């Protein structure tokens, strides 16, 4: 997708993975 919210979000994911 041209925005940039859902790679946004899978970063986020490995954000959230990130404990």
Known sequence: ???K???RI???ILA???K
């Open 16 to 18: 959230a993975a990130f």
């Open 10 to 12: 899978k970063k986020k």
């Open 5 to 7: 919210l859902l790679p």
């Open 1 to 3: 997708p041209m925005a």
